[PDB]
């Protein structure tokens, strides 16, 4: 199969490396699941140890943590927007780690109304306390909410876990990727 070993390929000197052994199962690799958007499917691959490792193939949804507010919501995905490594993966909408993705933002907007009551577009006391405790929201995130979208980095490896998780972009990361979206335009 796919040999991960160093017995093939050159030495540092530029010399062929002698090989007197057949391929070994512990020097294994497997074909890469370029997982994407769509309705959910996932395949348990039996690995070394007996231990199972769940290969993503299509993922609709994911758990995405807002960092500053300290909450996380289950959310549907819309599209893959940017990738650092390969522009072909954005072309096909392929979910990988470090991949920048669009997100519904109606879970966060419903929470932000309920928690604070400043909104976007007996308790009251609890809301005020929460506001004092924690709601200004960046100027760019204010514009971003108006579309009904957010931007977020995929943090999990979908191929290993069988799960798209991530975190929402904010501050310097958000200002950075807004350059290289606008530059291609």
């Amino acid at each position: 199969g796919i040999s991960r070993d160093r017995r093939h390929k050159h030495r540092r000197t530029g010399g062929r490396m002698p090989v007197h052994q057949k391929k070994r199962k512990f020097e294994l690799g497997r074909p890469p699941a370029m997982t994407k958007l769509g309705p959910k499917r996932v395949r348990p691959v039996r690995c070394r140890g007996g231990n199972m490792k769940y290969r993503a193939l299509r993922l609709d949804t994911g758990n995405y943590s807002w960092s500053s507010q300290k909450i996380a919501k289950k959310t549907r995905l819309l599209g893959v927007v940017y990738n650092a490594s390969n522009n072909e993966l954005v072309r096909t909408n392929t979910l990988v780690k470090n991949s920048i993705v669009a997100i519904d933002a109606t879970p966060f907007k419903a929470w932000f109304r309920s928690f604070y009551g400043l909104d976007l577009g007996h308790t009251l006391c609890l809301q005020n306390k929460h506001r004092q405790q924690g709601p200004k929201l960046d100027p760019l995130l204010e514009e971003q909410f108006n579309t009904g979208r957010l931007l977020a980095c995929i943090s999990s490896r979908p191929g290993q876990s069988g799960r798209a998780d991530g975190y929402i972009l904010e501050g310097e990361e958000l200002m950075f990727y807004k350059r290289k979206m606008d530059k291609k335009k």
Binding site: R6, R12, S67, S68, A84, S85, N98, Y167, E170, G171, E172, E173, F176, Y177, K180
Partner: protein, 147 residues
Amino acid sequence: VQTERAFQKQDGVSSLGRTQRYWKDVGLGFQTPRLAKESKYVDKKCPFTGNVSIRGRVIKGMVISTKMKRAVVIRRNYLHFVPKYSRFEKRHKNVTCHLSPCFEQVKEGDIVTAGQCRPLSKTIRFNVLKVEKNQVFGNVRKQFRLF
């Protein structure tokens, strides 16, 4: 500074900390340099800044080139005994080796100590710990020092 296609960010610092900088203390009787703490560079593979343990061995030697990016190559010299003739023999091995951009102006023919770590690429196993400025005249690869 953001040179590259992906956002270069230091792990250790959370997104809550966006002023704060992470710096490790590597131990083994090696002091953390000041330019690691003060400066704003990233490096994944730095001992003092990122996830890499130093562990096992420590190797001194002479730097012979600094051409490739964030990495050097360090000529070790040693005598090899030849028991028939009862007499020594000068050999060498070029260890290729990581270095971090806390160390400014690492000239050719400098002395450098370097601890072992996990394999970062194919050729490099070792990472730098500390450097010393000295001049060497003519060729560097001629210069035999034993340490």
